[PDB]
Design an enzyme around this catalytic site. Structure first.
Site, PDB file in Angstrom:
ATOM      1  N   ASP A  35       0.738  -1.247  -0.053  1.00  0.00           N
ATOM      2  CA  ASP A  35      -0.180  -0.059  -0.034  1.00  0.00           C
ATOM      3  C   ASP A  35       0.839   1.355   0.163  1.00  0.00           C
ATOM      4  OD1 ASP A  35      -2.005   1.834   0.379  1.00  0.00           O
ATOM      5  OD2 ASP A  35      -2.431   1.480   2.471  1.00  0.00           O
ATOM      6  N   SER A 199      -0.671  15.686 -11.954  1.00  0.00           N
ATOM      7  CA  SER A 199      -0.982  15.228 -13.455  1.00  0.00           C
ATOM      8  C   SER A 199      -0.968  16.448 -14.232  1.00  0.00           C
ATOM      9  CB  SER A 199      -2.338  14.162 -13.393  1.00  0.00           C
ATOM     10  OG  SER A 199      -2.502  14.103 -14.805  1.00  0.00           O
TER      11      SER A 199
HETATM   12  N1  LIG Z   1      -4.168   3.666   0.681  1.00  0.00           N
HETATM   13  C1  LIG Z   1      -5.179   2.447   0.840  1.00  0.00           C
HETATM   14  C2  LIG Z   1      -5.636   2.282   2.308  1.00  0.00           C
HETATM   15  C3  LIG Z   1      -6.381   1.040   2.797  1.00  0.00           C
HETATM   16  C4  LIG Z   1      -5.912  -0.043   2.663  1.00  0.00           C
HETATM   17  C5  LIG Z   1      -6.804  -1.366   3.011  1.00  0.00           C
HETATM   18  C6  LIG Z   1      -7.847  -1.141   2.965  1.00  0.00           C
HETATM   19  N2  LIG Z   1      -8.735   0.011   2.872  1.00  0.00           N
HETATM   20  C7  LIG Z   1      -7.875   0.866   2.799  1.00  0.00           C
END
Ligand SMILES: NCCc1cccnc1
Length: 330
Positions: A35, A199
């Site tokens: 993430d 962008s």
């Molecule tokens: N940057 C996404 C954050 C996130 C991660 C997992 C679930 N929900 C949201």
């Protein structure tokens, strides 16, 4: 050093991607959601409330000879979608695709919200935004990338997400066989802790390119592309029967439609998202209304270049002293 790991969609819609991660000694392999929009590495664990675990693989620190409680440390995170988790913290050895960090903070969940419980395929998250967003208290912890950085051949990682197919996260090198043409680099602001960039505009289908600055974040942990309401309206206006549905929670369109592509600017370069990448399928099983992959950011406070956008590109997260982002077609 370098690392290279395959990342795999969790379902037929590419709702998220999971990457295997080795934690502890002997290794415990968990499938984590990498993430770039957050900065905590947290896992389902032997400490997670039993009723909140439903099929996930758990980390058991007591079975790792290299695990150490980080005494007094706690964490608690809330994501933009209303999901959350919290717990305590161990340090342990963490490896991704052959790249090993010792002493990584592994945040063990005591509690997770329902959406995490309900997703049996995701064993936790591995944050790759800036460490300033890390939630551990009272001593903030570093991300896996920040810990690895100095050892890497080059202080970078790359995201090469697949459309309905596996892709790759590489650490420490740029695979020049993984993209076409050249990589266009663009400035990053770290002021909000994100890979935030601007962008240069957009086009819908074969339409003319609109030059306009769109500030947003490169976020591998968000499924969809969230853009200003003006841009999103211009896109869906090209799809017969598309409309914003307050009851469903966004733009929907007839499943019989053929979607136009969407182009976004990176400097003078252009990344084209094929129309099919924007189809997220029936809103409920058997419905002929389909959920759109481009949605308004109006209620969010930030534009988000999530997986819909990023999977159309080879993306370089350059963690040099002055960070930048690179995009190439592929
Ligand atoms: N940057 C996404 C954050 C996130 C991660 C997992 C679930 N929900 C949201």
């Amino acid at each position: 050093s370098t690392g290279s790991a395959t990342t795999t969609p969790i379902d037929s819609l590419d709702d998220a991607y999971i990457t295997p991660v080795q934690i502890g000694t002997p290794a415990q392999t968990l499938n984590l959601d990498f993430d770039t929009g957050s900065s905590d590495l947290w896992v389902f664990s032997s400490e997670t409330t039993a009723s909140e675990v439903d099929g996930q693989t758990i980390y058991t620190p007591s079975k790792s000879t290299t695990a150490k409680l980080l005494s007094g440390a706690t964490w608690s995170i809330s994501y933009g979608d209303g999901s959350s988790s919290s717990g305590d913290v161990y340090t342990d050895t963490v490896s991704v695709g052959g790249l090993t960090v010792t002493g990584q903070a592994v945040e063990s969940a005591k509690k997770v919200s329902s959406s995490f419980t309900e997703d049996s395929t995701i064993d936790g998250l591995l944050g790759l935004a800036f460490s300033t967003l890390n939630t551990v208290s009272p001593t903030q912890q570093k991300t896996f990338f920040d810990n690895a950085k100095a050892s890497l051949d080059s202080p970078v990682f790359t995201a090469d997400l697949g459309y309905h197919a596996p892709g790759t996260y590489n650490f420490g090198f740029i695979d020049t066989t993984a993209y076409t043409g050249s990589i266009t680099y663009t400035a990053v602001s770290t002021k909000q802790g994100f890979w935030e960039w601007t962008s240069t505009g957009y086009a819908v289908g074969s339409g003319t390119f609109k030059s306009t600055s769109i500030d947003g974040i490169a976020d591998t942990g968000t499924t969809l592309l969230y853009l200003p309401a003006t841009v999103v309206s211009a896109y869906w206006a090209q799809v017969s029967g598309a409309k914003s549905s307050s009851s469903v929670g966004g733009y929907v369109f007839p499943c019989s439609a053929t979607l136009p592509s969407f182009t976004f600017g990176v400097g003078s370069a252009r990344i084209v998202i094929p129309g099919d990448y924007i189809d997220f399928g029936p809103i409920s099983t058997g419905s002929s209304s389909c959920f759109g992959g481009i949605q308004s950011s109006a209620g969010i406070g930030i534009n988000i270049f999530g997986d819909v956008a990023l999977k159309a590109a080879f993306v370089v997260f350059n963690g040099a002293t002055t960070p930048t982002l690179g995009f190439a077609s592929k």
